[PDB]
Amino acid sequence: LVPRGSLDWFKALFWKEEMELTLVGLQYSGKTTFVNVIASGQFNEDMINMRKITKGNVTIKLWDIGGQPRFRSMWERYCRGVSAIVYMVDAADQEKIEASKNELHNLLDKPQLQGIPVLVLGNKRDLPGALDEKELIEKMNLSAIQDREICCYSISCKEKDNIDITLQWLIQHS
Numbered sequence: 001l002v003p004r005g006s007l008d009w010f011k012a013l014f015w016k017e018e019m020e021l022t023l024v025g026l027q028y029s030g031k032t033t034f035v036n037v038i039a040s041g042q043f044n045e046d047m048i049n050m051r052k053i054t055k056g057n058v059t060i061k062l063w064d065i066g067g068q069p070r071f072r073s074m075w076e077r078y079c080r081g082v083s084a085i086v087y088m089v090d091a092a093d094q095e096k097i098e099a100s101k102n103e104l105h106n107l108l109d110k111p112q113l114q115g116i117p118v119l120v121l122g123n124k125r126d127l128p129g130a131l132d133e134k135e136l137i138e139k140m141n142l143s144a145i146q147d148r149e150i151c152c153y154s155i156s157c158k159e160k161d162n163i164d165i166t167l168q169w170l171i172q173h174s
């Protein structure tokens with residue numbers, strides 16, 4: 001009996017969805033850690049920087065943003081058709097926020113990606129002084145993003161905090 005409403009409950013629901021997503025953000029933001037949590041440490045991975053993660057009916061295109069200039073266009077074009085963009089931010093690394101913001105805004109400035117919902121995740125909320133979702137909406141200038149649905153949650157992969165509401169949001173955007 002999988003406690004209804006538990007994290008395992010949402011994980012099960014999530015993986016059965018036929019869904020493509022991109023998971024992208026600066027290196028060290030917690031993207032690999034996040035996949036490991038939501039996939040319960042079991043998933044398929046194929047290199048394609050870019051990783052194609054598969055589990056259930058779900059495919060995740062995982063990549064670190066701000067990589068080689070020659071591959072940037074290729075990675076952003078590889079995101080065409082996804083149901084959602086999940087943008088991971090290290091909410092406790094104040095000095096990387098400006099780079100994180102600028103890469104997000106440059107990404108959402110790409111044509112093939114028009115209208116795709118974005119979920120910004122302020123990861124590492126467990127660390128003292130980490131930005132909360134209100135502060136991140138502010139520091140990331142999320143209000144400037146007007147041609148799409150954008151949402152922002154404060155989460156902890158380490159303490160498995162708000163991972164459930166993240167899965168629910170993703171399921172809603174199948």
Ligand SMILES: Nc1nc2c(ncn2[C@@H]2O[C@H](COP(=O)(O)OP(=O)(O)O)[C@@H](O)[C@H]2O)c(=O)[nH]1
Pocket residue numbers: 025026027028029030031032033034064088123124125126127155156157158159
């Ligand atoms: N304190 C804390 N550390 C985290 C959290 N999530 C990930 N990390 C750590 O951040 C470091 C980089 O994480 P990683 O998943 O490799 O980031 P990636 O480069 O975006 O894939 C690792 O040491 C993780 O354990 C979190 O929620 N809290």
